[PDB]
Amino acid sequence: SVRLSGYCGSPWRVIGYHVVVWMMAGIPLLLFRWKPLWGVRLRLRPCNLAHAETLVIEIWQLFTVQVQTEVLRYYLFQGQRYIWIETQQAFYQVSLLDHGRSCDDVHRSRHGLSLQDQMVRKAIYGPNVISIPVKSYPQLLVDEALNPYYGFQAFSIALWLADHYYWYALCIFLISSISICLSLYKTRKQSQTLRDMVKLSMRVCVCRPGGEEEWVDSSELVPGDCLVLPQEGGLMPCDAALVAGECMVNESSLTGESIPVLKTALPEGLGPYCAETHRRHTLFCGTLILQARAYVGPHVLAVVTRTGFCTAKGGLVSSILHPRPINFKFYKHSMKFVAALSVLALLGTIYSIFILYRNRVPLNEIVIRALNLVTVVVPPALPAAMTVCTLYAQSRLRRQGIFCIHPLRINLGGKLQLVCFDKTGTLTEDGLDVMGVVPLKGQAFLPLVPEPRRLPVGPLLRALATCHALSRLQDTPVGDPMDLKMVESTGWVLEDSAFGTQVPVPVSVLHRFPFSSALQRMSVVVAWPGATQPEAYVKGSPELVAGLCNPETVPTDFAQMLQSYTAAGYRVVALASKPLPTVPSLEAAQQLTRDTVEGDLSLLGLLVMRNLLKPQTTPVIQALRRTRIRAVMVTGDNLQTAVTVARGCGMVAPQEHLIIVHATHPERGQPASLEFLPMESRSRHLALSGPTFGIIVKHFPKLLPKVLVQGTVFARMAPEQKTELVCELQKLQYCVGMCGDGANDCGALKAADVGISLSQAEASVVSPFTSSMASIECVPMVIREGRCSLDTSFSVFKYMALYSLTQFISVLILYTINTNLGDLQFLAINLVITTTVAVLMSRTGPALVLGRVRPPGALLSVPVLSSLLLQMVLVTGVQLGGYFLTLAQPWFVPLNRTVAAPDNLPNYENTVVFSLSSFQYLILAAAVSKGAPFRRPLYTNVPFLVALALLSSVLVGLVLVPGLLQGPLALRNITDTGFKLLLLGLVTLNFVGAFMLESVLDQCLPACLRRLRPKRASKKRFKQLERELAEQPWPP
Ligand SMILES: CC(C)CCC[C@@H](C)[C@H]1CC[C@H]2[C@@H]3CC=C4C[C@@H](OC(=O)CCC(=O)O)CC[C@]4(C)[C@H]3CC[C@]12C
Ligand code: ALF
């Protein structure tokens, strides 16, 4: 639901709010950006909605929009207009102003729209542009640099500069600048992609009232305006309803289907016009009209219906710009994790205050010594690391051909638990391939002929090459893909309609009755030179055609062969012929009725057509089902063809039962009945239909979960029932992700948590993901990279936690002995080592196989916290060992406690602690990068391995080479070399210890975790249903 609230303006309250927020503190601003309702309530006085100058749109989410005027007083929410309807005293969207007008009104608006009315409709409906907002670089900076994170970073910069650590402040400024430039680049790239995608502006002629055709801009169209389409065609500027002629629209930009479409005129009547009912008569926005022709009148007319964000492209782009929140939260208990790690920072700050009180430090300096130690545990390179993870994920995906528009969907692509599929184009080849035609020799069937070219010239070959409705569109046949394929198999070329022999007289079409879905058959009138009389060829459903055929012509084995072909996934169409005593001429042929031609036929043969399975589909389905990711087929084809594809493409192993569930329609006096009829060739599937699924949704919402938990084949599903089913599967807490390609799928590719549009261009609005390949090989390529990304994010968070705690423990061990870490040593640690490593750690790709082990989803998980705590105990052990070992050395002399750093610094203690700590960082960085089973191993991204090698070598130089950078960094020059080798031995001990500890945890700890307290039950609803079914199977 939503809610509105008016806030009539007043300047005194506004200026009071501004001065209070600016003078008081940033904390009120922080709680405001966390609780904006209180902030907006304090800013301005509530008022009646008819007096508003500011709204509060709610979805509960909070948005603030401004009511503006031009009386017309309107506001734009998410780009959709809403206007002030005076009579109803409410804000009604503009998509609902004229919504509900009849086709007769659309036809009446054919004469156009007068300029005096066009100005009114342009005031109401606004400009006909999908205006992606343009934000200047200052606006972007105010967007990102006002984050409380960067506010705290600037506070820390000032805090350090007030301590004369200039180089560390420069370091923090440079890292925050890099983070801001990265965020700005990401945002600008997304906005540039969208603004490039939806940029169209042209000049289109407009039908003025009275017939004075006027040319105007494409940004000055209004619903109700009449638009004349160029005879040669062109890009379409706005949705429209055809009111004359036919069109050839290439709707790939809107629905991802590149095949030309026939768009006929609008059928008259008093039925209110619908964008879905009359979807054959509507020309959408952004679709490239190939060629349009006018049958009556000199020009083809379209009456605009939707302009701007109201259109189909406008709606999809409003969805892309303002995506709905993601339901599955990737980092669960992340706040509790950072709290369980901030308790450590608080304990350390207590120790700091205590030991600096004990060290007789000035209180004004104790406050700084504590605030610095607090700001150490806030890593300046956290946003940089996160956005670099997302950028690397996007780039790895784009490098294969998968084009993710907004990168936050990859993490969802990682934890997929269900994957739906189309069938035609996704699993099986897009176009039907004919297996051949079986001819008749008297009253018996002849062996199947794979090549119709080898058929001798006769009624069968002529029917194959002529009985169709193909038309040449720009020197290219267009029409039904089935008919086009059955034509190209014969080798004949279209030249009324005449056809030339492949290698044998041309064949002419005297008359043709168009195919009808209700009649499920079609007939034509065919004549050729040298023929005594024209012949009629009929193609349609074989059982219906055979009825019209002569009983003595139909073989007695017709039914058995038909059953054997149809149940095998083939699509068989019957071809029949009959002589016509009509004189060969176009005049008499045009008078033939369809009823006369259809009757009294002679069966020529059966044309068998197969839809082959792509070679890349079976391995993908097997590698999705051996990783326990359910695979479902949501198709709109037959149920037997779907079942045969699914059983062939690995969705149903030969030993898994598939129980076709059938729901009989509830007649008068009886309810709906579920009857289960199985099939003869996890452990049980169900193959619903479209009507059966609708019946089970309506009547039996109790037996619906046990149908969506084990149902595999969903055939005869209407384009809206695919979305129905995807939503119903999400209601069982599946992370379903659909992978379809055509125009039927684009309804569900939005509802699915990860939609992949199989065959696309560089990008499109149809679905979050796309792809530039034809096979479903891109579903594993998305799941693998989603797992790699969802694991890289955990690795980077863990490294930032470990690297902050290590630096904080180091600074504490130094504060205890009354030293600090210096000025250039902080710069080294937080820029050269840690930022480099954190931004190169995310570069290593995904694994090359899909594993049965799903990545974690919790940051507070006891593996993660046990790892952090054990790594930190080991690091603190190594640093305290180094310190307590530099004491026992003979050449040791303690520092001057009478002064604090950087005065007493350099000294031996700071030298030892920094030397160990700078290695601690690289060791934890290589210890948290775990390749198996999600990522490719560490050495397989040469930037990271070379970074680790160069930094380890440089630090070993610092430890071993005298005078090497020991002046700028202020490291005391240790003369002894045996103690240097002892420090390196302690470093290597920590290296081995960290790697061994991580291996021991990752291997053994899960077993003890299972044994100590096994999971009693799973929160997933589908998991509870799966257990309930394994205990007792539902369909008996
Ligand atoms: C002073 C020194 C020692 C600090 C080192 C910092 C660099 C190692 C970091 C800072 C930001 C990082 C960059 C941040 C983000 C990107 C992601 C990536 O960009 C793309 O994905 C290409 C986009 C496209 O072509 O579509 C390439 C690496 C790069 C520039 C990173 C490379 C390493 C950079 C330059
Ligand atoms: F086979 Al489809 F939508 F392409 F069901």
Ligand 1 binding pocket includes 381 (Cβ within 6 Å):
no
Long-range contacts of 270-278 (CB under 8 A, 24+ apart): 270/102, 270/103, 270/104, 271/102, 271/103, 272/100, 272/101, 272/102, 273/101, 273/102, 273/103, 273/105, 273/106, 273/241, 273/305, 275/239, 275/305, 275/306, 275/312, 278/103, 278/241
Is 686 in contact with 1035 (CB distance < 8 Å)?
A: yes
Q: How far is the CA of 923 from the centre of ligand 1 (A)?
A: 22
Residues making up the annotated binding site for Mg(2+) are: 741, 745
DSSP 337-348: HHHHHHHHHHHH
178 lines ligand 1 (CB under 6 A): yes
Q: List, in order, residues 6 or more apart from 733 with CB less than 8 Å away.
A: 1020, 1021, 1022
Q: Are residues 795 and 768 in the same domain?
A: no
Best CA proximity match to 284, nearest among 257, 255, 258, 264 = 255
**Listed residue (625, 681, 675) closest to 650, CA to CA:** 625
Q: Does 305 contact ligand 1 (Cβ within 6 A)? A: no
Q: Which ranges of 672-777 would DSSP assign to H, the alpha helix?
A: 690-699, 705-708, 719-730, 748-751
Strand pairing class (711-714; 521-527): unpaired
The answer to whether the CB of 241 falls within 8 A of the CB of 101 is no
Q: Give distance in angstroms: CA of 832 to centre of ligand 1.
A: 14
* Helix/strand/coil for 595: helix
Q: Which residues contact 551 (CB under 8 A, 6 or more apart)?
A: none
Query: Which residues sit opposite 669 in a β-bridge?
Result: none
Note the ligand closest to the C-alpha atom of 740: 2
Q: Which residues line ligand 2 (CB under 6 A)?
A: 422-425, 635-637, 740, 742, 744-745
Q: Give a yes or no: residue 849 inside a domain.
A: no
Measured distance CA(896)–CA(908) in Å, rounded:
11
437 and 419 inside one domain: no
Phi, psi of 633, rounded to the nearest 5 degrees: -110, 110
The amino acid at residue 819 is T
Distance between Cα 637 and ligand 2 center (Å): 7
CATH of the domain at 305: 2.70.150.10
Is the minimum distance from the CB of 836 to ligand 1 under 6 angstroms?
Answer: yes
Ligand nearest the Cα atom of residue 742: 2
The verdict on residue 177 lying in a domain is: no
Which atom of ligand 2 sits closest to the CA of residue 717? 5
Residue 363 tokens read as 């209180």
Residue with CA nearest ligand 1 atom 6? 836
* Amino acid letter, 528: W
Torsion of CA 508, 512, 515, 516, to 10 degrees: 180
Identify the three-state secondary structure at position 84: strand
Rounded to an integer, what is the distance from CA 872 to the centroid of its chain?
Answer: 39
- Closest residue CA from atom 25 of ligand 1: 395
Q: DSSP state, 265?
A: P
Question: Which atom of ligand 2 lies at the shortest distance from residue 423's CA?
Answer: 1
322-352 in b/e burial notation, b at 16+ Cβ within 10 A?
Answer: eeeeeeeebbeeeeebbeebeebbeebbeeb
In a domain, 195, yes or no: no
Q: Which atom of ligand 2 is nearest to the CA of 742?
A: 4
719 C-alpha to ligand 2 centroid (Å): 9
- Rounded to the nearest angstrom, the distance between the alpha carbon of 478 and the centre of ligand 2 is 20
CA-proximal residue: ligand 2, atom 3 (nearest): 744
Token pair, residue 723, equals 């979305």
CA atoms in the 13 A half-sphere facing the CB of 267: 6
Ligand 1 binding pocket includes 180 (Cβ within 6 Å): no
Q: How far is the CA of 955 from the centre of ligand 1 (A)?
A: 24
Residues 920 and 792 in one domain: yes
Choosing from 163, 422, 753, 791, the catalytic residue is 422
E strands, 521-593, are: 521-527, 535-540, 571-579
226 Cβ contact list (under 8 Å, min separation 6): 109, 110, 111, 112, 113, 206, 207, 243, 301, 302, 303, 304
> Is position 132 within any domain?
no
Measured from the CA of 392, which atom of ligand 1 is nearest?
21
Cα separation, 397 vs 400, whole angstroms: 6
Please tell me if the CB atom of residue 395 comes closer than 6 angstroms to any atom of ligand 1.
Answer: yes
Mutate-to-test residue for ligand 1 from 188, 839, 841, highest number of ligand atoms within 8 A of CB: 839
CA 481 centroid distance within chain: 30
Angle, vertex CA 736, rays to CA 732 and CA 741, nearest 5: 145
Q: 761 with 815, same domain?
A: no
Residue closest via CA to ligand 1's atom 29 equals: 388
CA of 782 to the centre of ligand 1 (A): 23
Work out which ligand 2 atom sits closest to the CA atom of 719.
Answer: 3
Kindly give the distance from the C-alpha atom of residue 845 to the centroid of ligand 1, in angstroms, as a whole number.
16
With contact defined as beta carbons under 8 Å apart, do 173 and 157 qualify?
Answer: yes
Q: Which helix (H) or strand (E) holds 42?
A: helix 36-43
Residue 484 maps to a domain: yes
Ligand 2 pocket: which of 430, 637, 689 to mutate (most atoms within 8 A of CB): 637
Tokens at 196, concatenated = 């490039």
Site of tokens 């006891």 = 862
CATH number of domain containing 731: 3.40.50.1000
Backbone angles phi, psi at 538, to 5 degrees: -120, 130
Query: Which of 173, 174, 178 to probe ligand 1 with, by most ligand atoms within 8 A of CB?
Result: 178
Q: How many domains does the chain have?
A: 5
CB 468 within 8 A of CB 514: no
What tokens does 635 get? 């198709």
Ligand nearest to the CA of 179: 1
Which residue among 744, 757, 776 is best mutated to probe the pocket of ligand 2, counting the most ligand atoms within 8 A of its Cβ?
744
Cα 430 to ligand 2 centre (Å): 9
Angle at 397 between CA 393 and CA 399, to 5 degrees: 120
Tell me how far the alpha carbon of residue 182 lies from the centroid of ligand 1, in angstroms: 9
Separation of 445 CA from ligand 1 center, angstroms?
Answer: 69
Please report which helix (H) or strand (E) contains residue 675, including its range. Answer: strand 673-678
Largest CA distance in the chain: 124
Q: Which neighbouring-strand residues pair with 215?
A: 205
Strands (E), 78-218: 80-85, 90-93, 203-207, 214-217
Rounded distance between C-alpha atoms, residue 639 and residue 472, angstroms: 34
Q: How far apart are CA 210 and CA 194, in angstroms?
A: 39
Which structural domain, as residue segments, surrounds residue 57? 1-94
Q: Kindly give the number of the ligand 2 atom that is closest to the alpha carbon of 428.
A: 1
> Residue 652's closest CA among 599, 713, 698?
713
Q: Is 422 a catalytic residue?
A: yes
Q: List binding-site positions.
A: 741, 745
Query: Do 565 and 626 lie in a common domain?
Result: no
User: The tokens of 978 are what?
Assistant: 């045996």
DSSP one-letter string for 187-240 = HHHHHHHHHHHT----EEEEE-TTS--EEEETTS--BTBEEEEPSS-EE--S-E
DSSP string, 462-477: HHHHHSS--EESSSSE
Q: Which residues contact 138 (CB under 8 A, 6 or more apart)?
A: none
Q: Are 878 and 428 in contact (CB under 8 A)?
A: no
- Give the ligand 1 atom nearest the CA of 391: 21
Nearest ligand to residue 426 Cα: 2
User: Which atom of ligand 1 has the smallest separation from the CA of 395?
Assistant: 21
Q: At what angle do helices 908-928 and 862-888 cross, to 10 degrees?
A: 150
Q: Say how many C-beta atoms besides its own lie within 10 A of residue 678's C-beta.
A: 13
Pocket test residue of 257, 259, 424 for ligand 2, highest count of atoms within 8 A of CB:
424
Please give the full DSSP string across 967-994, using - where no structure is assigned. Answer: TTTT------SHHHHHHHHHHHHHHHHH
What would the two tokens of residue 751 be?
Answer: 């509802």
For residue 281, the CA-to-ligand 2 centroid distance in Å is: 22
Query: Is 135 part of a structural domain of the chain?
Result: no
CB-ligand 1 contact for 833 (6 Å cutoff): no
883 and 939, same domain (yes or no):
yes
Task: Say if residue 815 is in the same domain as residue 881.
Answer: yes
228-264: b or e for each residue (b if 16 or more CB lie within 10 Å)?
bbeeebeebbbbbbbbbbbbbbbbbbbbbbeebbebe
3-state helix, strand, coil in the chain (%, to 5): 45, 20, 40
Ligand nearest to the Cα of 725, by number: 2
Is 598 inside a domain boundary? yes
With residue 770 as reference, give the H or E element that holds it. Answer: strand 769-770
Cβ of 258 below 6 Å from ligand 1: no
Radius of gyration of the chain (CA): 36
Tell me the CATH number at 341. Answer: 1.20.1110.10
> What residues contact residue 349 under an 8 Å CB cut-off, 6+ apart?
370, 373, 374
Domain shared by 568 and 484, yes or no: yes
Integer angstrom CA distances of residue 943 from 379, 648, 840: 22, 45, 7
SS3 574: strand
Residue 588 belongs to a domain with what CATH number? Answer: 3.40.1110.10
The rounded distance, in Å, linking the Cα atoms of 265 and 284 is 14
Tell me if the bond preceding 902 is cis, omega within 30° of 0.
yes
**How, if at all, do strands 261-263 and 769-770 pair?**
unpaired
Q: Is residue 1026 part of a domain?
A: no
Ligand whose nearest atom lies closest to the CA of 747: 2
Which method was it determined by? Answer: cryo-EM
Q: Are residues 589 and 681 in the same domain?
A: no
Burial string for 758-795 (b: 16+ CB within 10 Å, else e) reads: bbbeebbbbbbbbbbebbbbbbbbbbbbbbbbbbbbbb
Peptide bond into 906 cis (omega under 30): yes
Of 64, 94, 124, which closes a domain? 94
Atom 26 in ligand 1: residue holding the nearest Cα: 395
688 shares its domain with 736 = yes
Residues 394 and 467 in one domain: no
Give the ligand 1 atom nearest the CA of 174: 1
Q: Comparing C-alpha atoms, which of 250, 285, 412 is closest to residue 789?
A: 412
Does residue 388's CB lie within 6 angstroms of at least one atom of ligand 1? Answer: yes
Helix (H, G, I), strand (E, B) or coil at 503: coil
Distance CA(224)–CA(304), nearest Å, equals: 5
| 580 plus 621 within the same structural domain | no
Instruction: Determine which residue's CA is closest to atom 23 belonging to ligand 1.
Output: 395
| Candidate from 388, 843, 941 with most ligand 1 atoms within 8 A of CB, to mutate | 388
Ligand nearest to the CA of 637: 2
Q: Copy the structure tokens of residue 204.
A: 């289109």
Q: How far is CA 881 from the centre of its chain?
A: 51
